[PDB]
Design a protein around this ligand. Structure first.
Ligand SMILES: Nc1ncnc2c1ncn2[C@@H]1O[C@H](COP(=O)(O)OP(=O)(O)OP(=O)(O)O)[C@@H](O)[C@H]1O
Ligand SMILES: Nc1ncnc2c1ncn2[C@@H]1O[C@H](COP(=O)(O)OP(=O)(O)OP(=O)(O)O)[C@@H](O)[C@H]1O
Ligand SMILES: Nc1ncnc2c1ncn2[C@@H]1O[C@H](COP(=O)(O)OP(=O)(O)OP(=O)(O)O)[C@@H](O)[C@H]1O
Ligand SMILES: [Mg+2]
Ligand SMILES: [Mg+2]
Ligand SMILES: [Mg+2]
Lengths: 503, 275, 501
């Protein structure tokens, strides 16, 4: 067998091997140098079109030769030396002089029309255009460039739900011309979203088919019934013909996926909400978190989609209300625009209300999101939760949103000796797993719940359990600004009477 | 390799290269100027008829030479100079001038071509005639012309029910000769009207077949049972052979259609009632 | 016929025999020196291209001549002496010297060959990197090198559960470049874990397919239905094409596997927990035990994964608590880290508690282990146990962990000269390494902590208290020091580690 370098060469120099070449010309020279068989030459010799004889010559060849010698020592003799020269140049910019391969022998053939061919076939979605998150798409691409060298690796583009992770992968593989062609030869982008135990196998059934040639999709067998050890072996087989191939796994929920990705020695981009699925991999794991849209980025995003920018003071405030409410959230922000009808600062404030007295359902709309409202998404993030953690979350309703608050002040509403650190352990799992919370180490260990993550729970938990948690709080509440609430003044959560009376 | 100009020449001057020529005559002169191989000359040199030696000389040649030099510099020496003169004349009426033919007409009667043939096969309905909505059919065509450049795009011809949207798409693709042939190569017009959740997949089953060759409609498999990820991959596959292809989706009701159209990077005209 | 030397020459000097040569030129000279036949010369003489006449001359020739003489004695006469000189030079740099190339390197970058390519196709897992157990991965590799000579053999990398055996096989076949390429040609690594009686056959169904060519996985038949005598014959058949092939059988539980491996004359690396499965083989059996991580190795392992090393005295102690609790155990140690959140010596000690008042479930986490907690693993190690032995184990709860204690002091809680107790306790360390045997000064066993808090939160809450009472009964009737027979009447030394029930 060859390898990724020697097969990446047969692939890079492919635009050329199609314009002038013929496998019939080489069959005699290779039955000879002992690299073929009299059925091999039969199979490639009787083929109606040449792209057939070529794809079979390049498939059959990558398996048979101990090296890429007896094919340079042929384009020479066949007056096709402009070929054997290109390939020998490529094999040289790897062993002796490293690095120089991408700048020198790989880039001078980039073509902004070849990408689109490769993007479409790798099932990459149509990158977003009217606003681009500069910082992120950039940092993604960067950390991918650093790794094309690596043999297998995980990149975790993890964030809130609807926080915008998947869109960034669309853009990070769509801006540059380097990631596809220069750094990686091909792209395979597959959406996971698997919950069943058969899902982690079904996924890899459709990878294997993302790999397989346009030919023999007809021959696709009842692969539907065949062991896991075999789909796996069957894939890493058909994976030879794929030098430097990138895998986007849009929306992983199950860490079983991640275990398969690492048995299959794959190169993976990964969008997910739950970050801990990475503990499944004992490996090069590198991470990029899609944070809530910063206050300035929100403005940019609004303007980008024809949204009117403030003037009066209680108008920048009308807009700080939206930004506060959709606690910086791409998906629900978008639903907002699609639903801001007249464009007025006025009808923009109408909605700011609808949001307090109807939760996210006040702005649920038809959007590029698969989801009518962020609540349909978060549904799942909450089902997956440890049975005990589902409880912890369910009570954090009765908090103040967008307020930094102590662990003990939380120990009051949350279920379960004398040290309640167990509360903190749950609250970490809680930010790690859908980023529902928010951890903040010093000055003192405190968490915080945002508003989108709140009006979710508002119109979702048992109308009773809200009021029961409130009372369960006013009990512990007594017994003995850029400033956190002091322990001399916990007896009065009354500072937030405002944000508490609205229940 | 050559190219379209240098290969269009070997093809245009083909009525001639059949009446007087012989590949055996050139094999020695080309094994020499370094453009052949001792199997090449064997393959073209042992051929019963000459149209064989000629078709192999013109196939093998188009791959081997960096240019069309060592074949003008041969019909000269072979007393077949009336040939090397015609080909050098042709290479000049392109080398010394930056202007030719564009996508247009020099074999006329697109009346059965663009009209009849391409419209019928793309299942386009028989355009209305006794009244034409001037303004609209015009503006449709215009905004389609502006976009043949684009890689994928949606045009929404939306209106009341029975308001007449579908008829206008019939007319906008039936007036001009530009939209089909000049701006887009082929047409696929499919009526949606999907309400069930299986409808958005069934639609794209019949696209895939609107695409597939007249051959292998026999081989059409039980594609009826195969995942969405596969019909989708299977389509954008069979979609290579289809340069600039237009999609009319007459009567979309479900936005799931529109989501598929955008995963499949399609070029779509869309009649609908719900905007 | 020729051979590898004489045929390697016709192949090495092939770039040349194509540029200038012709089989028609030699046919007359060879029909003559008696090395051809009038059909031979017909076959090579009527061929359209020369690469045909050449490939047939070199194929036909390699069969017919007793040697490579009548072809040097020809390029000479044919004015192609620059050829017969090259070949005579090559035959001499082998005829006059007994030294060449060995199995090594002259086309470099086995980095995608031995590594990547052969490992991946043999389904070998992605070796661990951030800490390597020096001693062990080394000794594994060594004892494998010693055996590439052998025709068939078992290597038993046996240990505790989650004790780390499988990771070491990943590393022992991933460090060197020798084991794969030099010592063995190919690798087949298959996870067993078989419990059903159909499992030992199903395993070998997937070997047979680990063997079969990339071609004819399509033709794979309903082999699902075919006798054992046939899958076995069908394998050792398809096993010709596989010179020196290594078999890793990650996680054998059933000795029926081992019986098949020995009928199939296989070369096997074997990770297992139960060591006695080896009694199934009458053969070269060699063993390597994956012990509990020594106290110093635990430090190394912690530092390796960003774990803070002690300073204050009651901080090295906080860490000796973890090392004591996870009685040196790779898997539960890892679960600890993933769960040590802030990294503080503080939150590290929080967990040290959670471990005493919740058993292994206090630190159960998502880990590279297939298992949430070591208790999910050990489950099995306990089910397999002889019905009578399942009993013996179940009572050893009520002991002191990490204490060397006499056989008679055990005869007190265990059901039934009571040597029979000792026999059970050996089976017990042999089979999942749940116990711990120690011959002199006096026959004593010992239960570690990981092997304890397993039983703590697992045995009937009653059977704990019943065994404790059943002890305080026999307890009377007539440090680097073992407990004397003058002082058994008082197990009270361990009142501390007993009151916590
Ligand atoms: N850069 C952006 N430009 C425009 N809209 C965006 C952008 N980022 C996110 N969105 C909004 O979010 C929707 C899709 O969000 P996206 O898929 O990017 O988030 P996500 O993190 O993938 O969520 P999930 O993990 O649930 O897939 C889009 O329909 C759009 O409404
Ligand atoms: N020349 C014409 N231009 C426009 N509409 C016409 C014309 N002649 C007839 N119609 C009416 O429109 C009918 C078809 O309407 P059409 O299909 O154009 O509307 P539509 O927008 O497709 O409606 P739908 O909402 O059902 O898609 C004709 O059969 C006739 O009733
Ligand atoms: N560098 C390492 N060396 C040894 N063990 C490790 C290392 N890193 C982590 N581990 C722990 O061991 C786990 C896998 O354990 P391993 O499979 O080596 O034990 P095992 O002997 O195979 O157990 P089994 O009895 O289940 O076969 C890892 O996922 C982790 O919990
Ligand atoms: Mg998404
Ligand atoms: Mg209509
Ligand atoms: Mg294991």
């Amino acid at each position: 067998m060859l390898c990724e370098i020697e097969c990446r060469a047969l692939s890079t120099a492919h635009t050329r091997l199609i314009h002038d070449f013929e496998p019939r010309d080489a069959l005699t020279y290779l039955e000879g140098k002992n690299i073929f068989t009299e059925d091999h030459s039969e199979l490639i010799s009787k083929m109606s079109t040449r792209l057939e004889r070529i794809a079979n010559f390049l498939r059959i060849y990558r398996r048979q030769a101990s090296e890429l010698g007896p094919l340079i020592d042929f384009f020479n003799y066949n007056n096709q030396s402009h070929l054997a020269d290109f390939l020998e140049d490529y094999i040289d910019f790897a062993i002796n002089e490293p690095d120089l391969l991408r700048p020198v022998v790989i880039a001078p053939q980039f073509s902004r029309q070849m990408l689109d061919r490769k993007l479409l076939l790798g099932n990459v979605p149509k990158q977003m255009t009217c606003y681009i998150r500069e910082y992120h798409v950039d940092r993604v691409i960067k950390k991918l460039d650093e790794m094309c060298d690596l043999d297998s690796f995980f990149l975790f583009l993890h964030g809130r739900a609807g926080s915008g992770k998947s869109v960034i992968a669309s853009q990070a593989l769509s801006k540059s011309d380097q990631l596809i062609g220069i750094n990686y030869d091909s792209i395979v982008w597959l959406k996971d979203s698997g919950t069943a135990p058969k899902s982690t196998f079904d996924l890899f059934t459709d990878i294997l088919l993302m790999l397989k040639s346009e030919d023999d999709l007809l021959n696709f067998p009842s692969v539907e019934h065949v062991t896991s050890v075999v789909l796996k072996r069957m894939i890493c087989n058909a994976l030879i013909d794929r030098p430097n191939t990138l895998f986007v796994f849009d929306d992983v929920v199950q860490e079983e996926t991640i275990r398969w990705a690492q048995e299959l020695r794959l190169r993976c981009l990964v969008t997910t909400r739950d970050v801990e699925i990475s503990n499944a991999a004992s490996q090069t794991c590198e991470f990029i978190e899609v944070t809530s849209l910063e206050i300035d980025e929100c403005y940019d995003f609004l303007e980008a989609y024809g949204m009117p920018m403030p003037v009066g003071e209680k108008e920048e405030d009308v807009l700080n209300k939206t930004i506060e409410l959709s606690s910086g959230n791409p998906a629900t922000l978008m639903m907002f625009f699609k639903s801001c009808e007249p464009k007025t600062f006025e009808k923009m404030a109408q909605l700011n209300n609808k949001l307090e007295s109807r939760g996210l359902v006040g702005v649920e709309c038809i959007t590029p999101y698969s989801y009518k409202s962020l609540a349909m998404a978060l549904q799942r993030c909450v089902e997956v939760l440890s049975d005990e953690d589902r409880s912890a979350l369910a009570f954090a309703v009765v908090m103040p949103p967008g307020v930094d608050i102590p662990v003990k002040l939380w120990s009051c509403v949350i279920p379960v000796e004398q040290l309640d650190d167990e509360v903190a352990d749950r609250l970490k799992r809680l930010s790690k797993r859908g980023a529902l919370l928010s951890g903040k180490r010093m000055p003192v260990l405190t968490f915080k719940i945002d508003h989108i993550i709140h009006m979710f729970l508002k119109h979702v938990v048992d109308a009773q359990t809200i009021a029961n948690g409130i009372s369960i709080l006013e009990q512990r509440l007594l017994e003995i600004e850029t400033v956190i609430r002091p322990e001399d003044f916990p007896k009065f959560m009354q500072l937030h009477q405002k944000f508490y009376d609205s229940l």
